[PDB]
Design a protein around this ligand. Structure first.
Ligand code: PRO
Length: 348
């Protein structure tokens, strides 16, 4: 009997590019695992659900997944979607491994079923806060967030670390996802002499802020996190994106063992950036743990994940008792023109 595995992701809406990363990564992993004989002899069947980065629609997706006999979910992208969806999964025998949801709460509720292949924002905020102090000790910093669990959570963790290392921000403000006119906020930052904008949120608003700041004459560098890692940031921001900084794990597309896999994606017409290989790795973790458990029962795979080590596109993976992965930590990237002439994030 096929093992039914769902991709729950923002396949449409503002984060569609991230949805594609997650979908393409999981689909390719399923194809590769199937060609190798499947999971414990059984083929993987992929089902898709589009959450539109909307917690309400994410809950409808989770219901559809339960009805369809889903056993494992790779997803979701947004913490605000993943946290509520994970309770549906937890109460209905489904293991959820997110490749991108970073808010600490996701693995801090004592749920048997929650795992990640990505980091978490107390870690990320610690790294970013220290960076702010190490490199911009005397800067006037504005901390701005998007009022979501991810965005404000990250901004708050960073504020805490930055404050402890001696940086006191001159502004702390929230904006709404979907707001597009940042003239007033930018003017306020200019008045306050801001030279660094720390952004807790995703690429859409970051891109709008970067573009508008340059147009309005605010000389400030934007520093953000693992929510801005998409070419779409550059498409919105334009050349003003240059010099933007952000935290993210080591770029898995640069790992030598992934050379052939990255070439395969491109031969299929997809640039497998950012979370693509985190999603691929989530699939591999499920397959590895089922192999170790001698079972595809989600509760048994969960136990196996917490015990063993498994080969993935991110490197050898293992998990703590909360379901967080033991992998390389966050590093700082800068936006510059890559070898292909496009602006992208390059590790400093
Ligand atoms: O948890 C979240 O919502 C964001 C999405 C990309 C990185 N973490």
């Amino acid at each position: 009997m096929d093992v039914v595995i769902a991709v729950g992701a923002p396949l449409t809406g503002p984060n569609a590019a991230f949805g594609a990363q997650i979908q393409k990564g999981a689909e390719q992993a399923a194809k590769d695992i199937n060609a190798a004989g499947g999971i414990n002899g059984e083929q993987i069947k992929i089902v898709l659900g589009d959450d539109v980065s909307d917690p309400k629609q994410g809950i409808s997706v989770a219901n559809k997944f339960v009805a369809d006999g889903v056993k494992f979910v790779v997803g979701h992208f947004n913490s605000g979607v993943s946290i509520p969806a994970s309770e549906v999964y937890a109460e209905n025998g489904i293991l959820e491994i997110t490749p991108a949801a970073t808010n600490p709460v996701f693995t801090e509720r004592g749920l048997w079923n929650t795992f990640r292949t990505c980091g978490r924002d107390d870690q990320q905020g610690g790294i970013a806060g220290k960076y702010l102090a190490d490199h911009f000790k005397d800067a006037k910093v504005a901390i701005i967030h998007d009022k979501t669990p991810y965005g404000q959570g990250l901004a708050d963790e960073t504020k805490k670390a930055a404050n402890a290392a001696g940086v006191t921000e001159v502004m702390y403000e929230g904006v709404n996802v979907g707001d597009k006119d940042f003239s007033a906020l930018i003017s306020k930052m200019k008045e306050a002499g801001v030279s660094i904008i720390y952004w807790g949120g995703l690429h859409t608003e970051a891109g709008l802020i970067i573009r508008q700041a340059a147009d309005q004459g605010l000389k400030a560098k934007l520093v953000s996190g693992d929510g801005i890692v998409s070419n779409e940031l550059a498409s919105i921001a334009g050349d003003a994106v240059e010099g933007t900084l952000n935290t993210f794990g080591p770029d898995p597309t640069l790992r030598p063992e992934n050379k052939e896999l990255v070439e395969k994606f491109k031969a299929a017409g997809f640039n497998p950036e950012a979370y693509t290989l985190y999603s691929y790795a989530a699939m591999q973790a499920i397959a590895g743990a089922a192999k170790a458990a001698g079972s595809v029962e989600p509760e048994k795979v969960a136990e196996a994940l917490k015990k063993g080590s498994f080969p993935t596109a991110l490197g050898e993976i293992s998990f703590d008792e909360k379901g967080d992965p033991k992998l390389p930590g966050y590093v700082m990237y800068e936006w510059k023109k890559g070898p292909d002439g496009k602006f992208t994030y390059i590790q400093q």
